Each structure stands twice: as C-alpha cells, then as structure tokens.
Design an enzyme around this catalytic site. Structure first.
Site, short mmCIF file in Angstrom:
data_model
loop_
_atom_site.label_atom_id
_atom_site.label_comp_id
_atom_site.label_asym_id
_atom_site.label_seq_id
_atom_site.Cartn_x
_atom_site.Cartn_y
_atom_site.Cartn_z
N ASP A 35 1.04 -1.19 -0.01
CA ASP A 35 -0.04 0.07 -0.09
C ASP A 35 0.91 1.60 0.02
O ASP A 35 1.33 1.65 0.88
CB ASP A 35 -0.86 -0.15 1.17
CG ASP A 35 -1.77 1.17 1.52
OD1 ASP A 35 -1.86 2.02 0.26
OD2 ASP A 35 -2.21 1.54 2.49
N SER A 199 -0.91 15.48 -12.11
CA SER A 199 -1.22 15.37 -13.27
C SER A 199 -1.20 16.40 -14.27
O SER A 199 -1.85 17.61 -13.54
CB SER A 199 -2.37 14.41 -13.50
OG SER A 199 -2.89 14.13 -14.66
#
Length: 330
Positions: A35, A199
């Site tokens: 994770d 992004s």
C-alpha cells in the site's frame, strides 16, 4: 541488493493485490496488500482477537527465533475506506522477493475492523508511503522500503500491476523490459507523507486532451480512480445511462455499455486506461447496474490515482533524496 515479487489480484475485479512476504525465522509467509498510501506493515497474528480472524494466515511471533517485542510500542490506524486495525509491535526479519530487512517493525494486530476480517485473502498490509505517516507510538518506525533503501542497488521500487492478471513489485532496480517507450518522471511532494504529484490533464475516449493540473496521490492500496467531480462528470456523460447513485455510493452504468478509455497526463506524456479497466461489475449479484471505476474525490479531500490508474502503467517510486514518480506505458 534487489528484490522481485509477484503480486496477484485477490478476486476477479482486481479489488486489491496480494504479495507474499516472508516474516521471521523460520519463514512465515503471509500475503500482504502493498500500500503506497500508508506506512505501517501490520499483520494478522496469534494476538488477533479470535472472533476477528476468518481464514487469514497469521504471524506467530513466539515461533520466530528472530522476533523481539518492541517494548511499549503500540499502533493504531484508520484508512480512507473507514476500516481500521491496532495492536503491538515486534521487530523481525522480513523478506520480499529475495530482499531481506533485519529489524523490521512488524505490527501485530490485536484488533481489526470487520472489512479486514471479512477479507480472507489479505493477511495484512505493507505500507510503502513515507515513514512520517507510520503510526507506531511512542517511537515511530520505518517502512520496509525505508529500511531497505541504503542496501538497494538504486533507491527505488516499481509497481507493475496487472489487469485481471498477476504483476510485479520490484525493489532496487528498473526492469527495462517491463514497459514500452520511455519513463516520464514527475515531481513529488512529501508534505502529506504520500507519493503526491500533479497530473497535467485528462481526456475521455477519443476526445481532446484538457490541460489542467490535478494534484493527487499514487496509491496502490486504493482500488479505484478518484478525481474531481468536474472530471468524473465529463467521463460518465459519455456513457449512455450512467448516473451518480447516492444509494449505491457513486457512479453506476448499464452493464450493457461499452466504456470509453480515460487518459491522464504525466508531464507531456499520456497514460491510457482502457475502458474495460473502469468496469467493476454488477452492484449486486445478478444486477444489470454496474459500478464505475472512476469516482468523485469530492469529500475525500484528495484525488487518488488508485489501482484503476496505476495498473495501466509501469510506475517508478523513486526514493532518492528528492523523490520523484515515473510512469511508462506497457
């Protein structure tokens, strides 16, 4: 040194991925959920409340000759999905795909929440975010990656998750045969303890690319892709019959639909998530309403590039002095 381990979806929907991890001496092999959105390595154990164990493999420290109680240390964690666990701490030898760390903090669960109990395939978590998020008190502990880093050939790990198929976590090297084209690297902020990056935009299907900064985390421990409501609405508007259902808890769509792809920007590069990756199947057995793999992050407080996004790429987690993230198509 290096390590290489195969990671395998837990079910037919790729809800999560498990990777075998050797703990203790002799080895006790547990299947852990790697994770990149948390920083605790915790396991079901011989100390876990018996009623809260249902099919998991447990770590038994008393059977490990290298286990040592970390006196006074406790841990307690809550995850974004509302699940939680807590317990005490041992140090022991931990190996992943041939890469060995001695003195790794292994957090032994005394208590786990129902979602963990109900998932027989996950024996614990191995956190790969930054060690500043580690919950051990009163002495915070380091992640497996942080402990391994100095010994690694290169201070990196890579995630290559499969779509309905096994993939690979590598430590200490970049497998140049595992991706196509070039890896595009992008800046990371560690201020929140995550692999947080921005992004450069998105496209829906064959649509034009929208240049827009989307701050989010690369999180292998989250199933879906969570993005701003504007983005998500633009996606689902291209699927006839799709709608946001408060009763279900997100966007659903007719199972008869063909889903468009979703593209996200990494610098000037583009990662394309095929439409099929966005299908999470019927909301309940036999339903013709299907659950979407792109959902709104509104009210999470952060955008999350979870498995839906990451499995479309070869992803480099570069833990150099100034960390960065790299993405390649594959």
């Amino acid at each position: 040194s290096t390590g290489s381990a195969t990671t395998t979806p837990i079910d037919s929907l790729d809800d999560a991925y498990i990777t075998p991890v050797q703990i203790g001496t002799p080895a006790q092999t547990l299947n852990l959920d790697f994770d990149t959105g948390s920083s605790d390595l915790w396991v079901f154990s011989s100390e876990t409340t018996a009623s809260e164990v249902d099919g998991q493999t447990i770590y038994t420290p008393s059977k490990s000759t290298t286990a040592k109680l970390l006196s006074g240390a406790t841990w307690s964690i809550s995850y974004g999905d509302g699940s939680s666990s807590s317990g005490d701490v041992y140090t022991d030898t931990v190996s992943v795909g041939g890469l060995t760390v001695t003195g790794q903090a292994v957090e032994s669960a005394k208590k786990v929440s129902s979602s963990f109990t109900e998932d027989s395939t996950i024996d614990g978590l191995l956190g790969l975010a930054f060690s500043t998020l580690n919950t051990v008190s009163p002495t915070q502990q380091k992640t497996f990656f942080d402990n391994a880093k100095a010994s690694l050939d290169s201070p990196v790990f890579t995630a290559d998750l499969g779509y309905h198929a096994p993939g690979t976590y590598n430590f200490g090297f970049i497998d140049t045969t595992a991706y196509t084209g070039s890896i595009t690297y992008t800046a990371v902020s560690t201020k929140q303890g995550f692999w947080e990056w921005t992004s450069t935009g998105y496209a829906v299907g064959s649509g034009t690319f929208k240049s827009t900064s989307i701050d989010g985390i690369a999180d292998t421990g989250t199933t879906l892709l969570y993005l701003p409501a504007t983005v998500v609405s633009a996606y689902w508007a291209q699927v006839s019959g799709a709608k946001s259902s408060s009763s279900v808890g997100g966007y659903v769509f007719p199972c008869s639909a063909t889903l468009p792809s979703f593209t996200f920007g990494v610098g000037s590069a583009r990662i394309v998530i095929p439409g099929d990756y966005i299908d999470f199947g019927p909301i309940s057995t036999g339903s013709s309403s299907c659950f979407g793999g792109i959902q709104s992050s509104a009210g999470i407080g952060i955008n999350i590039f979870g498995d839906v996004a990451l499995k479309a790429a070869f992803v480099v987690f570069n833990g150099a002095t100034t960390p960065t993230l790299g993405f390649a198509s594959k």
